[PDB]
Design a binder for this molecule. Sequence first.
Ligand code: SAH
Ligand code: SAH
Lengths: 256, 263
Amino acid sequence: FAGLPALEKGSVWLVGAGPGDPGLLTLHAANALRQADVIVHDALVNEDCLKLARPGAVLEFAGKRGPSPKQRDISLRLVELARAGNRVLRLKGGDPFVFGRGGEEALTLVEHQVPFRIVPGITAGIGGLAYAGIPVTHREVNHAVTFLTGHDRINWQGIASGSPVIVMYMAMKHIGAITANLIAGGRSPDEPVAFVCNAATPQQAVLETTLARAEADVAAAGLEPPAIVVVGEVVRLRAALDWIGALDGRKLAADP
Amino acid sequence: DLFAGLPALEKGSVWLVGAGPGDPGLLTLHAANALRQADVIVHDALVNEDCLKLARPGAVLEFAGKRGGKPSPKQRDISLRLVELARAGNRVLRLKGGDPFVFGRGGEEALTLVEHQVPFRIVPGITAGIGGLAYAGIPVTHREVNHAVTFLTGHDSSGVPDRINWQGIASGSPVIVMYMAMKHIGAITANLIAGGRSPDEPVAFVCNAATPQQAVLETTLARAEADVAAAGLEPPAIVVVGEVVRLRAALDWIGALDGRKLA
Ligand SMILES: Nc1ncnc2c1ncn2[C@@H]1O[C@H](CSCC[C@H](N)C(=O)O)[C@@H](O)[C@H]1O
Ligand SMILES: Nc1ncnc2c1ncn2[C@@H]1O[C@H](CSCC[C@H](N)C(=O)O)[C@@H](O)[C@H]1O
């Protein structure tokens, strides 16, 4: 059960690995993983999906090695590999277009007449949250959701007003500033907030707190990247929708 | 060779599973695994044969949605039926379009499941607003364009008042991604313009993202309402507002039916 497009040559697929749990891979991803000659991957939350790679052909780490590689180089590696006839698979955490420089990579690709495909992935801000029992939207609660990165140019007031649920990528180092920005924008100090670290991995960990207390709580809990930060009433649903908790003993409750 | 340390879909439980936007390749391993195990697959109209072909033979396929003309089952009816299937000992798959938790009443369903003591799992899927737009060459995020994205429903934005604070939504993110915004595009688009958005800001409509029927219209906020009508376009569509729409000319990879090539 796979009659789907082949990973060709002079070509690169920018492929979403999801937040960690393999099997949150798309069938397109699994297939690409099966046929790539070379895989240029990130900081992977699960190094598990790489077990799918075809009879050992080159793995290529592209994250921090110790210094860094600037995107420019990573992108230009893809083209180098592609022009030399490899089936190239650029393997990205989560979804390639949700804060993952994927648009940059693809722009470079066309800029050098390299054909590409994009394979969407599960992003930590939606699927990861799901593994914590927190939906990004729920009828009674929100008709909008904003997804943002911590480093701004970011209209903090417009987000504060306007966005009943807020979902934050790379906001650990700045959590103190950000929550203070929301509170001053008219958000309640007591508004529920949740941190989810290593969403959808066996190392998953959750902090339930509050806009006013968030900075003290995550210092105290000793929490660390990678983490999605979510703000808003939907946090209250975790007590009721934590299906992972339910697998061990958890007694799931009713909404408010 | 394998995919076989994956969790079984157990007798008497319900999985809420995202089918993604259309393309069967966008199913997750977990979803494909559910499909192959299910005794009964309760699915959306916003579904798509190809997925369903993975069901074992003698699985039953139940259309949860609206048949005839408009005489709807309310959400509660669909949820109770899931409970009835599960209590009878079926392995139950509720197959939802896209992702179960993105404007798809998955929370409500799960909540109903909990109330009636039925265990469940959630299986994320690709959402039309991220993966769908990818198939049209529009990234939802791009560091030269935006550090924030807002997703919304236009569902109840007829113009009986409702509380989206359209001005906050206008200032909050350079990119806006809108679900169920076709029928009320005129009012929504005027909300955004009253909110400070430029009448000329680029807008794209993506209908049936990630299917052989995909169709895209670029336009602007002022012209959006007239244009979409003249183009004859229909739900399901995602409407994206902002500069990322300009990247489709350079990133339209599905436009590998033909060169004409990327800026
Ligand atoms: N498993 C995980 N759990 C929690 N947050 C995660 C995560 N994986 C990635 N992230 C978030 O994503 C940031 C990396 S930026 C890459 C985002 C990725 N393309 C995606 O769609 O998910 C991290 O700082 C963290 O905030
Ligand atoms: N294939 C597709 N192409 C374009 N828009 C789609 C789509 N599938 C779903 N949608 C959008 O989704 C709305 C239904 S509500 C379902 C949303 C789903 N949970 C998801 O994550 O995508 C539609 O009215 C339309 O705005």
